[PDB]
Amino acid sequence: SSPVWSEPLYSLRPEHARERLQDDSVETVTSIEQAKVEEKIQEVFSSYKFNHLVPRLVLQREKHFHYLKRGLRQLTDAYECLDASRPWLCYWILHSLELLDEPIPQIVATDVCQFLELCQSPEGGFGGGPGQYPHLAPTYAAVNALCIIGTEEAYDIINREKLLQYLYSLKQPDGSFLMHVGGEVDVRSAYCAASVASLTNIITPDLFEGTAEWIARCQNWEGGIGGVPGMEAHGGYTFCGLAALVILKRERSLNLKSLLQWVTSRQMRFEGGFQGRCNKLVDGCYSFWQAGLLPLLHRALHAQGDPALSMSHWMFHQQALQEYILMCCQCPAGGLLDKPGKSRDFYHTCYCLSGLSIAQHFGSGAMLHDVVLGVPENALQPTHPVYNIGPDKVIQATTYFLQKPVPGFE
Amino acid sequence: FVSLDSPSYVLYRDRAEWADIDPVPQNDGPNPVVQIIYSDKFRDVYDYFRAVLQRDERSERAFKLTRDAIELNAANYTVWHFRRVLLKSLQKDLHEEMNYITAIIEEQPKNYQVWHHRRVLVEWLRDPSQELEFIADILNQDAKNYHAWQHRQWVIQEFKLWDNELQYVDQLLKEDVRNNSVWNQRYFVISNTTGYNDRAVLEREVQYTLEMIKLVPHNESAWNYLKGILQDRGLSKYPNLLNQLLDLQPSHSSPYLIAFLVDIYEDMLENQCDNKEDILNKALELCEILAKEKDTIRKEYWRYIGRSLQSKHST
């Protein structure tokens, strides 16, 4: 076959050029923008090929580590726009470090715990910063961050009694949840609530009454799920919807056939990455929101006894996604990004790596099959498809909280 | 009055009309994490916002302060919530506030808080008279803005403004037939007005979609809409569609057409079609062509479909 120092790539096959956009000689803003991206991506792909010599791809772990380590402590005023999302920054950075198997010093871990405690609201839940009103987004992030740290100190920071009361204070009669008091409603809330409620063992029989049905109403003609009933299928909202249903054990409420066909169609034939909506551009962060749906669908179908499911691969091109992330989404100075030409940020660093991990690791029952493209060191730690934190962290947290009673309920 | 970038802007700590209240610093703890190095102007405004919030001061000065807090970080939902509390407490002119949010959304159209604020104002006023035009302006700048389309669907459904939306949809499809957001709006309008059970409407839609496919054969949105309006009843329930697609295949063997054929065969086999063995063989042949040549990015999906078909219809 091939010597160990050369690894043929899917994106470099001669026939891959046939995957370039065919605009039928009818130009619109959509095709013009798509063609511009493909042109740049082809240039990038070609820079990794030296005729028959194709060096193994490398995840710049050390560069990413230094970028993350610095951000966990300090951020430039360029992040003032995220002053109401500090727990998100904690989660994005800690999860990235977790995926890279970079240890978190005990002192830094305690400091994160203390900071998130300051973000916790007396009414329950966490806000975007100290003194801010609680909101389900930073609440979801804070809980995930605390679970990644996984110490009893971290677990006990969460005021479970008030958290459950807070969730009740956001619950609507139609099954949906507000993101915060007097705030907006969309499927993100159902997932944020289901995620934190299941991890901390505070689910009551009535908490999610009608929620599964509301989420199902969000699935549209495309097969994917929109933010609210009637809206366009979107990768981020679809991940929220399916993940929430998996937690509620109500995945069957959806048409899984149309959902599967929709998400698989979101992988770009030329770029290898995923787009968030049909006819929109590729973006590294959808490596998680979209690809993450495949392990969820695998689990859902496996629970139904689907005799046709693979026992070694997810139903998306795992190699092509790794090729897109490794060749197109890494910032040479550390951090990951949307696509070539875009600047790095902690959000894309988190989700590009999360998607890379999903693409590298397949697991079902007693079957495990890894596909780590490039040098062996590229292998990342696995991530749980529902919560997007390490599976070990999910088990440790759920076990810990299951030892506590549901707040004021039997 | 004065804006954050205005030459005469003065920090709140230097304003005489604010001297009577002490600012409240943000407590990040002794050993801060994800600490943002705020500009002096940013910290100044928020130190005073924290002060009025803590004292729950429902005043005109607090109201004006939120405007600056919003300019500094329009994503701060706490500031927006407090601003709404003030709008009510101070009985502020909501039409004036509508003019304000209009300007703010134009500046930051992908922000969740600004669109929700606008919705609240429309709900309080029960006045949607400016909505369709405003949203149209936002969509003229970004025809796929998710928040804009979502707000548009809410306004139309809540105030029953369906009368001219299909015309709007047709206009945008003419501009960019690949705009998936518009195809979604098309389904939204039809399903909520005439519905798709009216066979005259369904035929009109199938004809229109097929015409769009002929014009731009590789536009996925049209193909997805065609499947979308026929899938619930079952693709196998439309025998003439299969024949028409089979005729265009030799000249338009795109992955979209081939995949649609497999979708039809899947449903046919699910409904005890005649010549079952022949149909299964044809479907498996196409799955292989898709996996190996025409749609290789989805090789695993097509292999799965092939195995699925065999698990359900081999006999």
């Binding site: 999302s85 998100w88 987004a137 930073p138 959000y347 | 969740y112």
Partner: peptide, 4 residues
């Protein structure tokens, strides 16, 4: 890209 904004999540909230």
């Amino acid at each position: 890209c904004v999540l909230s």
